[PDB]
Amino acid sequence: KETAAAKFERQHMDSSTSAASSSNYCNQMMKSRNLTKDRCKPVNTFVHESLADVQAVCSQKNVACKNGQTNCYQSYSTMSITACRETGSSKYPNCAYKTTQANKHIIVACEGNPYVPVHFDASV
Ligand SMILES: [Cl-]
Ligand SMILES: [Cl-]
Ligand SMILES: [Cl-]
């Protein structure tokens, strides 16, 4: 089974580019990151920053998570992100995603030693 930290990396890190550059980015990335295997994951954000910058968020502003737990952290700076969301019509196994590039603060839940991101909670 995948570790929580590794799953966060796979689902949420895309340090290879500064920003999405195509409306097809999400279709391609959701597929390549294996997020469309048995079901189309309906919502997923990729962060276009270094892994180190994202990991560093775990020592930034501590905030409550959506679920009320208190191991969430909001990045001090905005980050380049691409939000992927299934279109209303998207139908597995032909997943279809809207790509929305933005620069926003991220909020991640952190856990472990090392204390690293394990969930992407939200952007603002
Ligand atoms: Cl784990
Ligand atoms: Cl995989
Ligand atoms: Cl997400």
* Parent domain of 32: 1-124
Total domains, the chain:
1
Distance 46 CA to ligand 3 centre (A): 7
| Strands of 27-90, DSSP E | 43-47, 61-63, 72-74, 79-86
Spatial distance between the Cα atoms of 34 and 36, rounded to a whole number of angstroms: 6
Spatial distance between the Cα atoms of 44 and 12, rounded to a whole number of angstroms: 7
Answer yes or no: 105 catalytic.
no
Answer yes or no: 48 catalytic.
no
Spatial distance between the Cα atoms of 114 and 121, rounded to a whole number of angstroms: 19
Give the CA distances from residue 50 to residues 23, 58, 91, 96, 101, in Å, rounded to whole numbers and listed in that order.
22, 14, 33, 27, 17
| CATH at residue 92 | 3.10.130.10
Residue 42 annotated as lining a ligand binding site: yes
